[PDB]
């Protein structure tokens, strides 16, 4: 009947690359790119890291905060755009790595950068219906931007997991409701063959990102009968810093409300991990009774909205695992050569 | 493909025409003289690649195909025979200015994707002196 | 040779139009023009439309048939005129010449463009330049106009600060325009420190790629009294057109547009007017330098001293003792829909000379009752000039 | 709250290719293959058909049987191994193609041949929790087998859709319970780059497919406190006929119990669509009060078990859309040349 | 008089595929193709054959006809469009396979379908200059046409080899002179990455093929002070029978003069083997004192012309190895499925 | 009667990359590499340069030195391992760009790093036989080293062209003789599909490079009746400085004899351009009557050896075009990022 987050966990790799390092190679003005997107740097996975490892690190951190035995997890869902295998599931390797196996169901989720929040909704349903006791939903990605392209300044790796439960005394946050707005939109895609995606350019913004994010934000607030004044914090999808702020400002959110959710200027766009990671940072700082609005976005033309309320149990779990902001500041910078080496961007 | 094939001797070797009635040199070669019309007698004339920068610009955001060259110098070169041409200049963006003596160079101007035809032609380079 | 006048003008909004379908744009302009004109669709004897893109984005030729079909005006003749950025004015001029012949009494001259649909508009815009001898070598459209600007500075000592002053005026004027793409003001520092497209030009020296549509209704001066009141009829004195070399490198002088000098002179001759009598002017300022040069080539000042004219601010709407140029945002701030721009320029003169409610906030002072428009295709290979008057 | 199927639908393309036609090309004995795998022919998609289109045809048929307005569907999930796009979702196209948009959630699911049934569980949760009133789950795939390989004889096209509902009177079947057995198994996989998969061979058989299917069968029967005599019909995963029967026989199911579920001999392995298509054929024949057992399999190492009971409302819905067996017999045979042409197996 | 052919040889694989078999798959009228292209069937290499093996078979047959020890061969050139390696040379394998190694020079030649004859000219020079005693030139190819394309009806496998010498007692034919016409033309090409080529369509004909073939034919006849009446037989490049005949007829050659050279109707286009194979069939039939005109063509634009006279020693050698026409008629037909299998056109 | 070089030319792109820049990225000790390979830096082509442009620059500089009208050039041969097209010939573009078209023969030669010198031999034969007045032979390449591999430190871009004439008054150098040693050896190769080659490692050295280079050097000296004492300068193939010097020292050449030929330490391995470029630098410095030994090597199993004598006319022509050493020192260094950008090593 009542559904909520019992545990959450996050992971960010140590390597970074500044905008300046990429621009230098491609003959662009860093201050121009830096100003435009409000991106300063991004995270870079180690060559021995991928979405599966990133998901496992975050999953394990979520179990620490939950403080529950992983044998009780009855479903694991991993939302990614960069699952290591095209057929073998990531969720299964994560389940094995937490020792939730074998009494569980799992599935790998695809829906551009919305994949992560899609599974949160799936876990909500299964726990709420009583079919499972706890479900885990993960949003993780090791995004790769085309070398010449602008997506190269933002594309980044990161992950975040959420454990959903029904026990009142275990919840650190409570779902008040969810809403989704989905259409068929060819703003951005990647076809089975291709290694790098193709985009529609300016058609990605107003008609796609804003259309779905704002409709989903409006829809949840109509469903809950609320206003922008009712929410303490907010997190939107962050392809670029600009898009995030424009959306927040458009709905009437002040910097104090949206400041905690925006990580892209120093993390980059972690695609399916973006909002999950943002939400995790809000939860790291949030006080009891804080109302949160979280709206995700996925290129195919989808948005997931959440209405969350924080619980007094927050103070207890926050320090049980690494804070999102601590992972984000534990960092090593690299140049572009090492970066293309790490990413396997160079032909071998 | 076919369009490339027609203006090869021009792009490759800078072969224009000379009007004997006028004395004027034309490049690219013209079928009809703008001044004399049908009166103009045309003979093929081989231009030296030598010229001077008449004006120039630096392209900072070109089509996705010129990603490697960005930023590049595009210029209008006044050739020593008289004709002016538009072409890129192989030099540092800080080293270009109006009046710089340049010389034509045979370069890979374009390609029709991964599978299509490669298109060669002139690109100017500053003289050593 | 019947005298031609304009009874009406309809214009869509300009810029990133995602919601508006292509058919909605032409309808929206056409219906608005019909309302202002107060003619019924059946009263239109013929349509003349010019489109440079020609569904380069869409892939669609034979646009005229499509437009007439969807307008529901079959079997009226519809024709498409093309001349790059000047396709609009050329559609108008073709519409004027049919009325003048007497074959049609009421004709619609329209322009429409859709460039948002294609991911890279750069390739289509470059189509106006010589593909074999400019585009082929990597000469982008902004780089061609940047090369004009450079030679102009080299010859006449124009500074970047002077050139950037043209943009602040444009954006200031555009805030008074509801149909403008940009309704914000800017400073000289903002214009100069904007992202560079092609040296010396920055993003804030260039007009943007944009969608939109505009339609005029031309009618015989005698018949014009039937549909409209005399005070809301504006007369087309002359519609001139000239040509120049398609490639900039083939021009005798780069700093000038001869085709504008030729066309503007012919237009002044038929109107029996000097440039000192022009109250308001709409010029093709796709790259700001094109704004300076046309001011000189239309004879509002001598060659070279365009920079002084703007840095002082003579062309501003607040200024009294000089011609007011681009009171609407213009290509820079109002927006540049290639096919529709040529029409829009003239529809602004219509509003300004008839002191319409549309340009109340940007109303220029009309002493002599004359206005000129200059539409340019490409770098100047085609120029079409229209001179309008409140008096026949 | 009680959860159940309110509508189901299925689609199979018209083209077939007999084992004999493939064997002929590769120098194999067709009778040996046919006996071995228990396969006679497989369906082939038209060159203008893909996973999406199949999903749409099956989704649309499920809506006909449900008899409800698609605007009421609050989630669409498409499980496949062959989503036309690597990033843009199929489920969003299906949602648009039935007019459920825009007030819904959707997601594309990957888990080998179990994906389809994984979404059924997702829909079960969302209506059961009350978050939506109807959810759709689709399993569909356009299967490609490597030209020389044995998977060429079975890999096939098809799909089936299920609408899950909350209301009693609208349910044609009721979920008594579900169970899943999942571990990490490298029996079969495909890497992001590769067009054709790589397999374990003999390791996929006994250790992986049988282990997970059988454990998931005892898991649901332990959870429900039942035995193989309690079930009227059964459907298992059917990579080939051999595996399906050996599993059914192993658990003690008779031919009469498992015959409706087994379609592979004339359809081939439709991967994510396999169990859904089998279950749909069981529902086409089933009588009121029939208890069925459905267990799926996915190569990565998971399985989904279902305990379902058939309701009075079936007699009404069955004829509202094409029966699975009718689509299966509406066919046109092709040779191998046309087949490689259709499939884009040509360089 | 100084330079001449002392030995020649040829090879054609056994497998064929009729136009009818290809057209059937792609929904075309075979009679239309056959009439249009003037082609009935084409050669298909076995999966264990390639340009290297074909070249070796032909080289070995040329040695038999020459009746000389291969240790005397001082240069081996292989002209192909389908060398097995992009870097390791075919010519080196052929040299090893005929035991001409190690005292020789070699090189792999590329110039579309003109590569084979390019090397004949190279051998002519080296023998004539005295730098070597005997040189071998081979033109061979295992052409691949794009599955849907028309080049699929003609692109075929074959090769022929020529040994050039200086000894009047060993010459079976004598070079009177050679001429070449070359320009830069983008009629047809293939970029390093791509497996199948791209063509300009109708621009390949008049402005490329005819321009270069006829200019080269007129140039050699101008060089030799010769007319069409002076030549007993002729061989031109044969992308299809249509082009070959139009060229021959254009120059004023009768059927009796050009018939032996035209093999494409039953062999297909072997690219760099085409004219070499044609010339070899002319030599199989030719009598002492016969004058041959041979003009090759390569896309990118080139043509090589030859003026040859047949010698008393001709009939002595013809039977020493398999006749071109015998290799062409020892054949085994295949369907398209087997054909795509053999060619590795399967993904 | 006598064959010789009438004109020669060379081209090297401006961009360089130091060993230090590459090693830095891959975690290797630069000093270890530099000592081991005897290489400090290499040439990098501009993204608007390729083997065709490089060949054209060379060819044009050779014409300046020759001082002859290009209409007289009877064939153009381009030997490369990196021809822009897999089918359309480079040599035709080169012929068109020097205005030698249309009365000429051409061909694109493939034989690893020995294709350049292969064509010199071809021109030697044709000129000597009298078939052409002048022939041009080019060796050019824009080599590719695999990112992680050691070949990345050497593989570089460069070219040189040579025009061959019969006339003593025009010759700046005279061929005394040539010799070639060729076998079939799988030391290094690249299959048609692959973009980067594969090598046998240590099998490339002693059994392949030394075997062929030293046998060819020994062979020429036997043919011409010479000794290391008879030669004034020498140039060998230079995959790295280590191999070159070992070979020179092995035959008994002193530093003063081999120093001009060795360019790899600051140029890298320009593959088909390596010995042509080395020989051009020897000719830039050489005095009248100097005897040069030039031995090339190609991975497939090849070596071409030349015995050349410098003539009076040498000092006349050297300054007519850019000296090899001047092109080599007119340079601009780039980091690894820029380098991989330029070379299209980015995916
Ligand atoms: C940079 C360029 C590609 C514009 O598209 P872009 O890459 O998305 O860059 P931007 O949209 O951020 O341009 C800066 C801003 O000025 C706007 N703008 C667009 N074209 C402009 C022009 N010619 N002049 C001034 N402003 C312009 C953009 O909409 C944007 O507004 P926003 O920040 O409120 O979204 C430009 O070169 C062009 O299109 N011309
Ligand atoms: K995938
Ligand atoms: K090759
Ligand atoms: Na080779
Ligand atoms: Zn003249």
PDB file of N, CA, C and O in Angstrom, chain B residues 3 10-11 28 30 54-61 66 72 74-76 84 86 88 98 109-110 119 122, chain C residues 119 122 132-134 136-140 143 146-148 150-151 154-155 196-199 248-250 254:
ATOM      1  N   UNK B   3      31.116  15.773 -62.449  1.00  0.00           N
ATOM      2  CA  UNK B   3      31.455  17.197 -62.323  1.00  0.00           C
ATOM      3  C   UNK B   3      32.925  17.343 -61.968  1.00  0.00           C
ATOM      4  O   UNK B   3      33.563  18.314 -62.371  1.00  0.00           O
ATOM      5  N   UNK B  10      41.834  22.065 -64.598  1.00  0.00           N
ATOM      6  CA  UNK B  10      41.804  23.349 -63.909  1.00  0.00           C
ATOM      7  C   UNK B  10      42.238  23.162 -62.466  1.00  0.00           C
ATOM      8  O   UNK B  10      43.224  23.752 -62.041  1.00  0.00           O
ATOM      9  N   UNK B  11      41.538  22.302 -61.721  1.00  0.00           N
ATOM     10  CA  UNK B  11      41.835  22.061 -60.309  1.00  0.00           C
ATOM     11  C   UNK B  11      43.250  21.521 -60.092  1.00  0.00           C
ATOM     12  O   UNK B  11      43.892  21.862 -59.098  1.00  0.00           O
ATOM     13  N   UNK B  28      38.686  30.400 -63.484  1.00  0.00           N
ATOM     14  CA  UNK B  28      38.583  29.224 -64.363  1.00  0.00           C
ATOM     15  C   UNK B  28      38.324  29.582 -65.813  1.00  0.00           C
ATOM     16  O   UNK B  28      37.775  30.642 -66.108  1.00  0.00           O
ATOM     17  N   UNK B  30      36.770  30.118 -69.326  1.00  0.00           N
ATOM     18  CA  UNK B  30      35.409  30.503 -69.682  1.00  0.00           C
ATOM     19  C   UNK B  30      35.081  30.091 -71.117  1.00  0.00           C
ATOM     20  O   UNK B  30      35.960  30.095 -71.980  1.00  0.00           O
ATOM     21  N   UNK B  54      44.482  38.122 -51.256  1.00  0.00           N
ATOM     22  CA  UNK B  54      43.692  39.338 -51.474  1.00  0.00           C
ATOM     23  C   UNK B  54      42.810  39.615 -50.254  1.00  0.00           C
ATOM     24  O   UNK B  54      42.696  40.755 -49.809  1.00  0.00           O
ATOM     25  N   UNK B  55      42.221  38.565 -49.691  1.00  0.00           N
ATOM     26  CA  UNK B  55      41.447  38.641 -48.458  1.00  0.00           C
ATOM     27  C   UNK B  55      41.421  37.240 -47.881  1.00  0.00           C
ATOM     28  O   UNK B  55      41.778  36.289 -48.577  1.00  0.00           O
ATOM     29  N   UNK B  56      40.972  37.094 -46.641  1.00  0.00           N
ATOM     30  CA  UNK B  56      40.985  35.794 -45.978  1.00  0.00           C
ATOM     31  C   UNK B  56      40.024  35.756 -44.809  1.00  0.00           C
ATOM     32  O   UNK B  56      39.611  36.793 -44.301  1.00  0.00           O
ATOM     33  N   UNK B  57      39.686  34.554 -44.365  1.00  0.00           N
ATOM     34  CA  UNK B  57      38.850  34.369 -43.186  1.00  0.00           C
ATOM     35  C   UNK B  57      39.266  33.073 -42.496  1.00  0.00           C
ATOM     36  O   UNK B  57      39.985  32.268 -43.089  1.00  0.00           O
ATOM     37  N   UNK B  58      38.962  32.953 -41.202  1.00  0.00           N
ATOM     38  CA  UNK B  58      39.269  31.745 -40.456  1.00  0.00           C
ATOM     39  C   UNK B  58      37.984  31.063 -40.049  1.00  0.00           C
ATOM     40  O   UNK B  58      37.247  31.596 -39.231  1.00  0.00           O
ATOM     41  N   UNK B  59      37.757  29.850 -40.545  1.00  0.00           N
ATOM     42  CA  UNK B  59      36.513  29.137 -40.296  1.00  0.00           C
ATOM     43  C   UNK B  59      36.604  28.327 -39.008  1.00  0.00           C
ATOM     44  O   UNK B  59      37.317  27.329 -38.957  1.00  0.00           O
ATOM     45  N   UNK B  60      35.855  28.730 -37.981  1.00  0.00           N
ATOM     46  CA  UNK B  60      35.946  28.095 -36.670  1.00  0.00           C
ATOM     47  C   UNK B  60      34.934  26.969 -36.488  1.00  0.00           C
ATOM     48  O   UNK B  60      35.133  26.113 -35.628  1.00  0.00           O
ATOM     49  N   UNK B  61      33.801  27.024 -37.207  1.00  0.00           N
ATOM     50  CA  UNK B  61      32.766  26.006 -37.069  1.00  0.00           C
ATOM     51  C   UNK B  61      32.295  25.534 -38.434  1.00  0.00           C
ATOM     52  O   UNK B  61      31.238  25.939 -38.914  1.00  0.00           O
ATOM     53  N   UNK B  66      35.058  18.652 -42.129  1.00  0.00           N
ATOM     54  CA  UNK B  66      36.319  19.368 -41.982  1.00  0.00           C
ATOM     55  C   UNK B  66      36.780  19.411 -40.520  1.00  0.00           C
ATOM     56  O   UNK B  66      37.629  20.230 -40.183  1.00  0.00           O
ATOM     57  N   UNK B  72      40.412  26.454 -39.970  1.00  0.00           N
ATOM     58  CA  UNK B  72      41.186  26.570 -41.196  1.00  0.00           C
ATOM     59  C   UNK B  72      41.054  27.926 -41.842  1.00  0.00           C
ATOM     60  O   UNK B  72      40.020  28.576 -41.748  1.00  0.00           O
ATOM     61  N   UNK B  74      40.409  29.983 -45.015  1.00  0.00           N
ATOM     62  CA  UNK B  74      39.894  30.117 -46.360  1.00  0.00           C
ATOM     63  C   UNK B  74      40.324  31.497 -46.871  1.00  0.00           C
ATOM     64  O   UNK B  74      40.542  32.408 -46.064  1.00  0.00           O
ATOM     65  N   UNK B  75      40.617  31.611 -48.172  1.00  0.00           N
ATOM     66  CA  UNK B  75      41.100  32.881 -48.700  1.00  0.00           C
ATOM     67  C   UNK B  75      40.727  33.083 -50.146  1.00  0.00           C
ATOM     68  O   UNK B  75      40.370  32.138 -50.842  1.00  0.00           O
ATOM     69  N   UNK B  76      40.840  34.334 -50.604  1.00  0.00           N
ATOM     70  CA  UNK B  76      40.762  34.633 -52.016  1.00  0.00           C
ATOM     71  C   UNK B  76      42.141  35.062 -52.444  1.00  0.00           C
ATOM     72  O   UNK B  76      42.714  35.957 -51.843  1.00  0.00           O
ATOM     73  N   UNK B  84      41.404  35.811 -59.735  1.00  0.00           N
ATOM     74  CA  UNK B  84      41.314  35.499 -58.315  1.00  0.00           C
ATOM     75  C   UNK B  84      40.576  34.171 -58.124  1.00  0.00           C
ATOM     76  O   UNK B  84      39.649  33.840 -58.873  1.00  0.00           O
ATOM     77  N   UNK B  86      39.135  31.256 -54.935  1.00  0.00           N
ATOM     78  CA  UNK B  86      38.840  30.934 -53.554  1.00  0.00           C
ATOM     79  C   UNK B  86      39.408  29.558 -53.267  1.00  0.00           C
ATOM     80  O   UNK B  86      39.219  28.637 -54.060  1.00  0.00           O
ATOM     81  N   UNK B  88      41.568  27.103 -49.733  1.00  0.00           N
ATOM     82  CA  UNK B  88      42.133  27.104 -48.391  1.00  0.00           C
ATOM     83  C   UNK B  88      43.632  27.428 -48.450  1.00  0.00           C
ATOM     84  O   UNK B  88      44.269  27.216 -49.483  1.00  0.00           O
ATOM     85  N   UNK B  98      46.757  39.812 -45.371  1.00  0.00           N
ATOM     86  CA  UNK B  98      46.564  40.216 -46.765  1.00  0.00           C
ATOM     87  C   UNK B  98      47.911  40.574 -47.409  1.00  0.00           C
ATOM     88  O   UNK B  98      48.735  41.255 -46.790  1.00  0.00           O
ATOM     89  N   UNK B 109      41.162  17.615 -51.434  1.00  0.00           N
ATOM     90  CA  UNK B 109      40.223  18.674 -51.082  1.00  0.00           C
ATOM     91  C   UNK B 109      39.025  18.105 -50.361  1.00  0.00           C
ATOM     92  O   UNK B 109      38.425  18.800 -49.528  1.00  0.00           O
ATOM     93  N   UNK B 110      38.544  16.944 -50.838  1.00  0.00           N
ATOM     94  CA  UNK B 110      37.318  16.362 -50.317  1.00  0.00           C
ATOM     95  C   UNK B 110      37.228  14.877 -50.583  1.00  0.00           C
ATOM     96  O   UNK B 110      38.015  14.327 -51.351  1.00  0.00           O
ATOM     97  N   UNK B 119      38.364  13.763 -54.077  1.00  0.00           N
ATOM     98  CA  UNK B 119      38.432  14.933 -54.938  1.00  0.00           C
ATOM     99  C   UNK B 119      39.666  15.750 -54.615  1.00  0.00           C
ATOM    100  O   UNK B 119      39.833  16.181 -53.481  1.00  0.00           O
ATOM    101  N   UNK B 122      43.476  22.355 -55.736  1.00  0.00           N
ATOM    102  CA  UNK B 122      44.482  23.302 -55.286  1.00  0.00           C
ATOM    103  C   UNK B 122      44.231  23.773 -53.868  1.00  0.00           C
ATOM    104  O   UNK B 122      43.097  23.857 -53.399  1.00  0.00           O
TER     105      UNK B 122
ATOM    106  N   UNK C 119      19.150  18.580 -40.240  1.00  0.00           N
ATOM    107  CA  UNK C 119      20.098  18.703 -39.138  1.00  0.00           C
ATOM    108  C   UNK C 119      21.185  19.740 -39.459  1.00  0.00           C
ATOM    109  O   UNK C 119      21.519  20.552 -38.598  1.00  0.00           O
ATOM    110  N   UNK C 122      23.721  24.357 -43.073  1.00  0.00           N
ATOM    111  CA  UNK C 122      24.915  24.926 -43.684  1.00  0.00           C
ATOM    112  C   UNK C 122      25.066  24.504 -45.145  1.00  0.00           C
ATOM    113  O   UNK C 122      25.524  25.295 -45.966  1.00  0.00           O
ATOM    114  N   UNK C 132      31.179  24.738 -57.570  1.00  0.00           N
ATOM    115  CA  UNK C 132      32.399  24.203 -58.167  1.00  0.00           C
ATOM    116  C   UNK C 132      33.642  24.949 -57.673  1.00  0.00           C
ATOM    117  O   UNK C 132      34.716  24.347 -57.566  1.00  0.00           O
ATOM    118  N   UNK C 133      33.512  26.256 -57.396  1.00  0.00           N
ATOM    119  CA  UNK C 133      34.682  27.107 -57.219  1.00  0.00           C
ATOM    120  C   UNK C 133      34.722  27.863 -55.897  1.00  0.00           C
ATOM    121  O   UNK C 133      35.707  28.535 -55.623  1.00  0.00           O
ATOM    122  N   UNK C 134      33.730  27.690 -55.039  1.00  0.00           N
ATOM    123  CA  UNK C 134      33.787  28.260 -53.698  1.00  0.00           C
ATOM    124  C   UNK C 134      33.488  27.179 -52.668  1.00  0.00           C
ATOM    125  O   UNK C 134      34.394  26.707 -51.983  1.00  0.00           O
ATOM    126  N   UNK C 136      33.071  23.983 -52.972  1.00  0.00           N
ATOM    127  CA  UNK C 136      33.983  22.854 -53.155  1.00  0.00           C
ATOM    128  C   UNK C 136      35.239  22.970 -52.301  1.00  0.00           C
ATOM    129  O   UNK C 136      35.703  21.979 -51.759  1.00  0.00           O
ATOM    130  N   UNK C 137      35.790  24.176 -52.180  1.00  0.00           N
ATOM    131  CA  UNK C 137      37.068  24.379 -51.514  1.00  0.00           C
ATOM    132  C   UNK C 137      36.928  24.665 -50.026  1.00  0.00           C
ATOM    133  O   UNK C 137      37.930  24.653 -49.313  1.00  0.00           O
ATOM    134  N   UNK C 138      35.698  24.729 -49.549  1.00  0.00           N
ATOM    135  CA  UNK C 138      35.426  24.872 -48.130  1.00  0.00           C
ATOM    136  C   UNK C 138      35.026  26.279 -47.766  1.00  0.00           C
ATOM    137  O   UNK C 138      35.173  26.684 -46.609  1.00  0.00           O
ATOM    138  N   UNK C 139      34.549  27.050 -48.747  1.00  0.00           N
ATOM    139  CA  UNK C 139      34.167  28.438 -48.502  1.00  0.00           C
ATOM    140  C   UNK C 139      32.740  28.474 -48.015  1.00  0.00           C
ATOM    141  O   UNK C 139      31.803  28.301 -48.798  1.00  0.00           O
ATOM    142  N   UNK C 140      32.575  28.618 -46.698  1.00  0.00           N
ATOM    143  CA  UNK C 140      31.247  28.682 -46.104  1.00  0.00           C
ATOM    144  C   UNK C 140      30.662  30.048 -46.386  1.00  0.00           C
ATOM    145  O   UNK C 140      31.378  30.973 -46.743  1.00  0.00           O
ATOM    146  N   UNK C 143      31.998  32.745 -44.206  1.00  0.00           N
ATOM    147  CA  UNK C 143      33.393  33.028 -44.518  1.00  0.00           C
ATOM    148  C   UNK C 143      33.503  33.914 -45.754  1.00  0.00           C
ATOM    149  O   UNK C 143      34.423  34.728 -45.830  1.00  0.00           O
ATOM    150  N   UNK C 146      32.661  37.243 -44.457  1.00  0.00           N
ATOM    151  CA  UNK C 146      33.781  37.665 -43.608  1.00  0.00           C
ATOM    152  C   UNK C 146      34.949  38.172 -44.457  1.00  0.00           C
ATOM    153  O   UNK C 146      35.669  39.083 -44.048  1.00  0.00           O
ATOM    154  N   UNK C 147      35.137  37.574 -45.637  1.00  0.00           N
ATOM    155  CA  UNK C 147      36.188  37.993 -46.556  1.00  0.00           C
ATOM    156  C   UNK C 147      35.858  39.352 -47.193  1.00  0.00           C
ATOM    157  O   UNK C 147      36.753  40.176 -47.356  1.00  0.00           O
ATOM    158  N   UNK C 148      34.566  39.643 -47.396  1.00  0.00           N
ATOM    159  CA  UNK C 148      34.106  40.968 -47.812  1.00  0.00           C
ATOM    160  C   UNK C 148      34.426  41.984 -46.724  1.00  0.00           C
ATOM    161  O   UNK C 148      35.032  43.020 -46.997  1.00  0.00           O
ATOM    162  N   UNK C 150      36.574  41.802 -44.329  1.00  0.00           N
ATOM    163  CA  UNK C 150      38.012  41.994 -44.198  1.00  0.00           C
ATOM    164  C   UNK C 150      38.532  42.990 -45.232  1.00  0.00           C
ATOM    165  O   UNK C 150      39.249  43.922 -44.874  1.00  0.00           O
ATOM    166  N   UNK C 151      38.180  42.799 -46.512  1.00  0.00           N
ATOM    167  CA  UNK C 151      38.652  43.680 -47.582  1.00  0.00           C
ATOM    168  C   UNK C 151      38.134  45.096 -47.397  1.00  0.00           C
ATOM    169  O   UNK C 151      38.834  46.055 -47.707  1.00  0.00           O
ATOM    170  N   UNK C 154      40.268  46.622 -44.694  1.00  0.00           N
ATOM    171  CA  UNK C 154      41.581  46.897 -45.269  1.00  0.00           C
ATOM    172  C   UNK C 154      41.563  48.168 -46.131  1.00  0.00           C
ATOM    173  O   UNK C 154      42.561  48.890 -46.180  1.00  0.00           O
ATOM    174  N   UNK C 155      40.453  48.415 -46.849  1.00  0.00           N
ATOM    175  CA  UNK C 155      40.371  49.516 -47.808  1.00  0.00           C
ATOM    176  C   UNK C 155      39.866  50.802 -47.177  1.00  0.00           C
ATOM    177  O   UNK C 155      40.181  51.877 -47.676  1.00  0.00           O
ATOM    178  N   UNK C 196      32.972  32.970 -32.282  1.00  0.00           N
ATOM    179  CA  UNK C 196      33.260  33.305 -33.681  1.00  0.00           C
ATOM    180  C   UNK C 196      32.834  32.216 -34.658  1.00  0.00           C
ATOM    181  O   UNK C 196      32.973  31.025 -34.374  1.00  0.00           O
ATOM    182  N   UNK C 197      32.224  32.624 -35.768  1.00  0.00           N
ATOM    183  CA  UNK C 197      31.836  31.712 -36.835  1.00  0.00           C
ATOM    184  C   UNK C 197      32.932  31.716 -37.900  1.00  0.00           C
ATOM    185  O   UNK C 197      33.481  30.662 -38.234  1.00  0.00           O
ATOM    186  N   UNK C 198      33.269  32.914 -38.401  1.00  0.00           N
ATOM    187  CA  UNK C 198      34.356  33.113 -39.362  1.00  0.00           C
ATOM    188  C   UNK C 198      35.006  34.487 -39.142  1.00  0.00           C
ATOM    189  O   UNK C 198      34.328  35.505 -39.253  1.00  0.00           O
ATOM    190  N   UNK C 199      36.304  34.516 -38.807  1.00  0.00           N
ATOM    191  CA  UNK C 199      37.007  35.760 -38.507  1.00  0.00           C
ATOM    192  C   UNK C 199      36.887  36.734 -39.678  1.00  0.00           C
ATOM    193  O   UNK C 199      37.121  36.337 -40.821  1.00  0.00           O
ATOM    194  N   UNK C 248      32.319  35.601 -55.448  1.00  0.00           N
ATOM    195  CA  UNK C 248      32.894  36.831 -54.922  1.00  0.00           C
ATOM    196  C   UNK C 248      34.266  37.097 -55.541  1.00  0.00           C
ATOM    197  O   UNK C 248      34.629  38.250 -55.760  1.00  0.00           O
ATOM    198  N   UNK C 249      35.041  36.038 -55.801  1.00  0.00           N
ATOM    199  CA  UNK C 249      36.377  36.195 -56.360  1.00  0.00           C
ATOM    200  C   UNK C 249      36.347  36.680 -57.812  1.00  0.00           C
ATOM    201  O   UNK C 249      37.402  36.973 -58.366  1.00  0.00           O
ATOM    202  N   UNK C 250      35.157  36.753 -58.436  1.00  0.00           N
ATOM    203  CA  UNK C 250      35.023  37.224 -59.821  1.00  0.00           C
ATOM    204  C   UNK C 250      34.543  38.678 -59.879  1.00  0.00           C
ATOM    205  O   UNK C 250      34.367  39.216 -60.969  1.00  0.00           O
ATOM    206  N   UNK C 254      35.001  43.946 -54.449  1.00  0.00           N
ATOM    207  CA  UNK C 254      34.334  43.115 -53.451  1.00  0.00           C
ATOM    208  C   UNK C 254      33.545  43.950 -52.459  1.00  0.00           C
ATOM    209  O   UNK C 254      32.562  43.462 -51.903  1.00  0.00           O
TER     210      UNK C 254
END
